[PDB]
Symmetry: C3
Subunit: 501 residues, 3 copies
Amino acid sequence: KDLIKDIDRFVNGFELNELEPKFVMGFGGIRNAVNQSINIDKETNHMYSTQSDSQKPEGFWINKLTPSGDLISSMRIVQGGHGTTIGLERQSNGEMKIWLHHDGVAKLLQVAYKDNYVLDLEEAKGLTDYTPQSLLNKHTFTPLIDEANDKLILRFGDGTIQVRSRADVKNHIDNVEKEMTIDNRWMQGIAVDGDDLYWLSGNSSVNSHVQIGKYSLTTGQKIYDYPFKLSYQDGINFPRDNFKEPEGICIYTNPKTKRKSLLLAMTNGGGGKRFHNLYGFFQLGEYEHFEALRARGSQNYKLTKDDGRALSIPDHIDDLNDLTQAGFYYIDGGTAEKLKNMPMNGSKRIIDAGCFINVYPTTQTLGTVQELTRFSTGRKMVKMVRGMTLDVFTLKWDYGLWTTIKTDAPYQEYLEASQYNNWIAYVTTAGEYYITGNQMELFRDAPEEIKKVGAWLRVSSGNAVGEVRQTLEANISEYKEFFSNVNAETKHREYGWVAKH
Amino acid sequence: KDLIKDIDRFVNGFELNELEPKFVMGFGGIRNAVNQSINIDKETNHMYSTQSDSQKPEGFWINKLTPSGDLISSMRIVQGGHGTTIGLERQSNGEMKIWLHHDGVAKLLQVAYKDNYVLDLEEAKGLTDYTPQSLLNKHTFTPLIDEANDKLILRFGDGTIQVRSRADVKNHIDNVEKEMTIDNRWMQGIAVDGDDLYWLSGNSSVNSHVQIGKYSLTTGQKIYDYPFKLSYQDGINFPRDNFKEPEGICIYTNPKTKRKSLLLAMTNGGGGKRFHNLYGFFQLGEYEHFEALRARGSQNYKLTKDDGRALSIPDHIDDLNDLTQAGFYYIDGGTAEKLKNMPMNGSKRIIDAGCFINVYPTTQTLGTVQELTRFSTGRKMVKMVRGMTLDVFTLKWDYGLWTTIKTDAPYQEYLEASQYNNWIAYVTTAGEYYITGNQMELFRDAPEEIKKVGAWLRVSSGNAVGEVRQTLEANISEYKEFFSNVNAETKHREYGWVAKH
Amino acid sequence: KDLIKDIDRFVNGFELNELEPKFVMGFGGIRNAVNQSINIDKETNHMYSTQSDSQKPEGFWINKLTPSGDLISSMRIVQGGHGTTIGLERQSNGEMKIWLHHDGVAKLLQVAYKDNYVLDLEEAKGLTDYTPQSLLNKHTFTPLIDEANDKLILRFGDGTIQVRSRADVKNHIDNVEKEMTIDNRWMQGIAVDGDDLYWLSGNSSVNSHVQIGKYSLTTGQKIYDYPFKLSYQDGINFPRDNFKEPEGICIYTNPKTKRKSLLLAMTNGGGGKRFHNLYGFFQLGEYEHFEALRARGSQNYKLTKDDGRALSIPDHIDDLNDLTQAGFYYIDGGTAEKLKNMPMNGSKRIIDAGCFINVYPTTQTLGTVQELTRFSTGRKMVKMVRGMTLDVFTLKWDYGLWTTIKTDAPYQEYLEASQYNNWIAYVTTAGEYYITGNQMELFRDAPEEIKKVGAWLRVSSGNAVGEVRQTLEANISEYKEFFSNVNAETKHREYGWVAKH
């Protein structure tokens, strides 16, 4: 007897104060401001939210969102009021209509939603009024809808709840089917599911607990108050910037399983940095409905380690040519010293330290780019990129030449003659380097005129025959500059240094 | 009596038309083309798909995939046909064999899977034939496997379904154990689980509903047709580029829980942009098996806000030195004006607008790079990077010098003399700037020869003693260029401007 | 009778060897080393791990982690020993205390956790000793806590398990409530839940199976051994770099649902590349508790396709101005040829190949940057960026000018005169190009002095009046260089080429 009454409660129960709140997904909105309301369109899985527009007579935005919380479009109700609650009613032709109270014209409206559209005041005046006959000159309410029973509920400032038939209001029929009274801490959201009414309250402080009160529309009295703690960025009651404001609730009934969820919108983050997170209370198995919706819009390919560390290259990779899989990698100096096919300037390995390797998300045919960033703190950071493509018939790779992204720091890119076999001609990678007087003496192809003094070395891009022009500018108080062409591959110098001075 | 028959159905039922389809994960494939089939290797959690090769006599690719849908390797069956279905049979030594019909040689084959391998026609001719004796000169079928019962099923073009024992076919035994007939809308997939046969149909149009027909192998007749709608990128029946083609099904039996799932492959996206998404119908609790597999391969560290906005820096961060946590951030102009340790050119804050801050996914020892991008629309975008490392013994950070990534726009990088205390020597960050005639008059260290005319200022990289060379090129119709070295830190000028003309 | 005993087992059972291990999330740690232990703080959802410090007398780190595995802070116990197990005890004021055995001072300690703090030896000597009276000169144990029953358990090297009351130890009361003996393969973790004791074993090899032994504290004997296989990066027993070491276990009791989970920490990856992954065994419905915690810290906005391919632009996008949604995109050469508002140098489309398009994660007001990377393998890669902002009142976009990131390769950026209507003045984008002798003859505004010979073309940044200076350096063995200003927009040349030689 009892074991079944326990299993049925756990499997089929939907008593709010017995359910655990769980994070569902984040969601957006056009405004850099807190959220206000949240609603689900059960026929599409679209989400709709409202936000203030922050204007002299307050208006609000309506945001149309993907099932994963991304912004599709927004609609502004100029001087429409706070937009505390709205009601969704999808029409037969697939167009969405929004039940809202336009405070500017003092009318209950059923507006057609339009993508990235501004509903100015002059248009709102010409729209059809659906305000009930008994509610003229009494415009202190906002509407919401009970989808399961097709009810249009009106919430009044003084705390009056009016349950009406949506079809009745659409047909200009004034009939109040149910009326109850709701009553430091003020209203943050309201949702109605049949006989059950839910009342969200709590302020943004970390010290203010979030609470949902459950009421019965037949009895008219409170069943219970349900305080609860949510897990934020850093855990329970540790939200980013110590801000956690409740911003609306809605009941969702799964069209297929007919089982229920109560969704809760929270805004976290500090001033000018607000972002919105959806939480929920679920019957057994219903969290998966929204997890799948989140997963569809999530990043499902791993770009970094789960703790924010860059990926490490597999142990079996001993050749940069084989690191063709997209991701953000890092290799330490030891690995950079041994990997095959690293960028060279003759005998010198250009990347002579640890290195970030950004392998681009690939083309549709698995082509990609390797972007290397030499990781040092005492020298400039070198950035180089090369591309590569895969032949889908031979399954062999073709690797392109290296492009250098120009970088410079207030410290020298020092050239040690011995590392280049004492050949300036080895340096054919574009960029600016410095040769000290001591090293100039050791370079075999240094210009005699400045054999014992330092100079900046500048290397140009290639010409049509694969040659690059090297320029030496003497680091002295008089103008002395030389140039000479070098073949980038063979390092053969075309002619001796030519003086410009 | 009834409450238990309801709980048991919900907990232990696996009736297809009572189950909700849920997105599972995306998955890849070597070809830039639609998917064709999908199968699970229960002993490894590997997935296998097939794709056309798009060649004159059609061949197909076999893709070996990770449990999270990433591509491990592929195998091409040159002129093997469409590859509509295949059968997986993992051998004892851990090698995978693929049951497939090679249309080019007109033989049912059991081929060893090889990574990134091309099975050309000459090799396929020397492979062992497993075509049943009664099926020679009748090669209009493809094979599939029922893992739970070790059956090898053959699907014929005319709609004949032949259920055979896999071991029998391997032993060259011709015995048809069961045969039934399946019968605008054509076949997109077939899966067999014991007595239950599933038949997938539907075309790529948004107006064509996806449907799975359930049949009984003992009765031979249809039990029911099950049409359903899937939730795509933007919700129910809103797939990217209005393309949603069904591309195969398979039944999965959990080796541990022995509970079942029916997985469904869809291809979305437009021409040349196809991508594949896995959906599923699950017994209670079985979705978690595949969610964990997706999660293992997903990006589990937050790089951006959930709606695509960049991260905001925490309110407690008032110093760039403290923003060492990986992620893609943005700070507005106000924050950029106040943050400590922002890049300077003397008294001038280089980033004089909003700024993107890319904090690299870190090294294994939590070293990282901060890449700043000044966000403007009327001026060029400045990009600068610096590195930093953490001492694991003292838990103190060491910050490196700033590297400038060279950027230029068809508009000037304007120098206002007052912002640099009227010292050109303050500008020691490498790059090109412009000084108007009016501002040259206000700079104290301007060259007298061009005191009243504008000029481009070019600042080089450092030399060995921390000095940088400034170059001024007069913006006039005659050649006038000067240079002078400046110490990057102290802004001390080594000597007066030296004319090159 | 039996159908209920089956449902109750499946719904309410927590028998370890009947549960499936599932990946939960990855987690970090300050050290580049394997993990050692894992524990949950049920009052915050924080996680705590330990790692060796790899020093001459071994110490260990304590890592405080977010519910999604990110590193909050770490605390080093200098010469504290191996840190094999620890016990969490959260105090009333919200501060965390750690039960640990400090091998350096040979004392059982209850240390206050401090963020990024080094507990040196001199401080550890002045801390209060909680070692039981009967355990002096017998310091071969580490502590752990059974949260549900407030027990402090001591594990000894010889295999002795001592169950004590935590409050007793805090009050310096020496009372052993339960003692049992546990007994190639050694201990990797231990967790106690009431009467149940769990013993983790197995080494890092792929050929060494992970195993948890379940014991009863009342009987003192083993109930059963439970070997199991985990799914790693590439599937079951396919971990990265063939390394899979078990690194601790803990029992978690959900404070709300009172249902249980057994969590297991694994370290994967090769030497110097270790990373940690959390697995778990769950009662029905309890996996969702940790999935929501992972999801809160995951990347929930899609930057790439699920297989690592870059995003494709929607078919309805025929204008770069409309690609304002964040993400990493790629367009092929055909699409780059047709898209409106691509970068131009007069009549020439600069991006004359496939192109990666990085649309930055947006500002709080949906401003973003488009970073283009021309994808070629035989030519240099061009990188250009522009910004754009959205007017929240008009919902119209403002697009900024293009910035060029300087790039160069050892091959030429070839200029074909016909593509620029035979006007060098068309090339106003900053950078270095090459004009062959043949093409110089075809350019109408080439300098006569070098009409028949090649030259590098260098284009500067703009000045105050929107003009850019073009420089031509003759590719000959004698010094010949010219300059001339051109208006970037109208391509009007201000004056003829001015010789520097």
